[PDB]
Design a protein around this ligand. Structure first.
Ligand SMILES: Cc1cc2nc3c(=O)[nH]c(=O)nc-3n(C[C@H](O)[C@H](O)[C@H](O)COP(=O)(O)O)c2cc1C
Length: 106
C-alpha cells in the first residue's frame, strides 16, 4: 500500500491524520495542505455521486468497500482512483481509524 491516508472518525468530519509520501506525490498536495481535512477534497465535477454514496454508507456502517471513482489532483488533473476503505478497530473492538488506500488506475 503505497498511497494511503488514515482518518480519525472520533474527530469532527473524519479528518485525515496521516498521509503517505506516495499519496502526496499522487495528489500534488503537501502534507500541511491536507492534514486535519476530510479526504472529499479529492472529488470534483465528474466524480460519480452514487459511488460517493456507497463510500458514505460504508463509513456509516463501518465496513470495508472497494469502489472506482474519478478524483482530482491539486492542479485539477483527473484520475481514476481504485479506492479501498477499511475500518480499523482498537483492542476493545471500538472503531478507531479508517484507512483509505488509493490506486491510480489511469
Ligand atoms: C480514510 C479515508 C480515506 C478516503 N479516501 C478517499 C479518496 O481517496 N477519494 C475519495 O474520493 N474519497 C475518499 N474518502 C471519502 C470522503 O472522505 C467521504 O467519506 C466521501 O466523500 C463520502 O462522504 P461525504 O458524502 O460526506 O462526502 C475517504 C474517506 C476516508 C475515511
Amino acid at each position: 500500500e503505497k498511497n494511503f491516508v488514515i482518518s480519525d472518525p472520533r474527530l469532527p468530519d473524519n479528518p485525515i491524520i496521516f498521509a503517505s509520501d506516495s499519496f502526496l506525490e499522487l495528489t500534488e498536495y503537501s502534507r500541511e495542505e491536507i492534514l486535519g481535512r476530510n479526504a472529499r477534497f479529492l472529488q470534483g465535477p465528474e466524480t460519480d455521486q452514487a459511488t460517493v454514496q456507497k463510500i458514505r454508507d460504508a463509513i456509516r456502517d463501518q465496513r470495508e468497500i472497494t469502489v472506482q471513482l474519478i478524483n482530482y489532483t491539486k492542479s485539477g488533473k483527473k484520475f481514476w482512483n481504485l479506492f479501498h476503505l477499511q475500518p480499523m478497530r482498537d483492542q476493545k473492538g471500538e472503531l478507531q481509524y479508517f484507512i483509505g488506500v488509493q490506486l491510480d488506475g489511469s
